[PDB]
Design a protein around this ligand. Structure first.
Ligand code: FG6
Ligand code: FG6
Ligand code: FG6
Lengths: 288, 275
């Protein structure tokens, strides 16, 4: 067991180190909370941390790992924002006691070998054009879960499809962890928090409010039915300068092979220049 | 409340939740949880797995019996009770797959070789169910026979690749008196086939001893023995390193054979040391 100093930010790179500390803590009665991140931390991540902090007797582990296995692509991996110094500063500010910052070598010493094969959900929406993306996500999340063995793991609702898939991973592999989804933190105008927001110029930043505007308009239009909700969202996206919509789709909450009932999720993906933005919202139809 | 558990008796659970709760309760009291996964119809090979598991001080032994779709009940339990096994886990297909087939394990490239030739997807099924069983039971050690060697290596790859906190224990293959590897298929062999089937183990043992003369001597010895058997259609005879990569010029390896006799496929494998 490596050194662990309570009340301070302890940073471990070796999977075996955090595993050992985690297990030692769990045996002393502490409940281990995991917030898995790819770094470049914003207020949305801090909301995950805070949710974890508030579980009584918790110790919070924040993982930071830019997982090469979930990138296509050529350049996407290299282009991903990396701001390590700010990240750890934020964790210290928030009173986090463990950051887990493994190397690529430690996570993938044998390269890609055994992997998670997601269900059919991974071939839709975000996964349509990116066929191995969610296999990459689920493989890393499985590994982080096995390494840290948390009682609860925290994810934002912003990447809703990812969240659903992770719930599938946990159910389908009988993992002994509770998955906690945390509502999307937004800028004051309603823009969903995102690492990618930094890539919007002032004009694109202005236009980008249209995603959240469209979703919230649809959620209130929805007393008038599905068609009205979708048409309200489409109108708002269409009014916005330089927003190219990739999909706007209304699905059941599990996004699964079932028709929408009264309760749904409306999901949007759109491009502003080269920046691709996602957002989603709970929809009640007829309210209902 | 924890499901009822009576120490020193055979406790049978069909609900994954029940065995999970009891195993956790047991671990917290100090017991080391040992898992022996099976598809039932228990034979001496399985009892060797059980006996290995029981040897660990402070062990509680969990034997799962589950016929995986993706890859005698009363006698089975009698045998386990006779061995002093305290937990049998006997789930339904529905309990194991309540949402059907969805998230699964994708084996690495090794699954496409050797047995993955006649059965490209077999190992995906095995690895998925083994992972589920490990997660439900959370054993300290899990026990497999060495007879399905490729399977065993893929399991160890699963454990490595997904950072599982279980120790994988390979137990030497139990064999009939003439050396035939124990298998549920052996009973279907007519007497001519049962006689010929001894060629698999005989070829592999001859090879292991021929190996002082080198790799080619060992392989040629094996082949000559197989060539002396009628009605034995050899699918492969392959010498590999112990992880089933290419055999190094010298050192430890494994020699693997598969053959068809009439309609039954037989496999065997053996440790080989080169030179
Ligand atoms: C509570 O409000 C919000 C709002 C938006 C949020 C978040 C919280 C969190 C993210 C986010 O992405 N985090 S992540 O990239 O570090 C990540 C890494 C990772 C690794 C494994 C599994 C899941 C994983 O998620 N985001 C949106 C964003 O950044 O675009
Ligand atoms: C529908 O169009 C396509 C196009 C290419 C595709 C697929 C579908 C499916 C795969 C695929 O499953 N490859 S894999 O099993 O070796 C794998 C690679 C990988 C990478 C990161 C994470 C997990 C991973 O699992 N591939 C890539 C391929 O065949 O090479
Ligand atoms: C120590 O000496 C031996 C010798 C031969 C042996 C074994 C032990 C065990 C088996 C065997 O296969 N058992 S199994 O069918 O119940 C099985 C359960 C299971 C669970 C998960 C994955 C694969 C699985 O396969 N066999 C060979 C046999 O019976 O054919």
């Amino acid at each position: 067991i490596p050194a662990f100093h309570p009340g301070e930010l302890n940073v471990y790179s070796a999977p075996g180190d955090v595993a050992d500390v985690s297990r030692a803590l769990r045996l002393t009665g502490r409940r281990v909370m995991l917030v898995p991140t790819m770094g470049a931390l914003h207020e949305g991540h801090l909301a995950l941390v805070r949710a974890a902090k508030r579980v009584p007797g918790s110790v919070v582990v924040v993982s930071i790992f830019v997982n090469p296995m979930q990138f296509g692509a050529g350049g996407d991996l290299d282009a991903y924002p990396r701001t390590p110094d700010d990240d750890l500063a934020q964790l210290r500010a928030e009173g986090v006691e463990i950051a887990f910052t493994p190397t690529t070598a430690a996570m993938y010493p044998d390269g890609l070998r055994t992997t998670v094969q997601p269900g059919p959900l991974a071939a839709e929406l975000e996964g349509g054009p990116r066929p191995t993306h969610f296999a990459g996500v689920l493989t890393v999340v499985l590994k982080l879960l096995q390494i840290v063995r948390p009682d609860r793991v925290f994810f934002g609702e912003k990447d809703y499809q990812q969240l659903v898939l992770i719930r599938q991973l946990v159910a389908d592999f009988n993992l002994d962890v509770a998955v906690v989804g945390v509502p999307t933190v937004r800028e004051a105008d309603g823009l969903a928090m995102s690492s990618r927001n930094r890539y919007l110029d002032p004009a694109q930043r202005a236009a980008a409010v249209a995603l959240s505007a469209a979703l919230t308009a649809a959620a209130h239009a929805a007393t008038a039915g599905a068609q009205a909700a979708l048409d309200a969202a489409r109108a708002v996206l269409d009014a916005a300068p330089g927003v190219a919509v990739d999909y706007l789709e209304l699905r059941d909450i599990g996004l699964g092979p079932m028709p929408l009932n009264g309760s749904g999720r409306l999901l949007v993906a759109a491009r502003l220049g080269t920046t691709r933005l996602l957002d989603n919202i709970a929809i009640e139809i007829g309210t209902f």
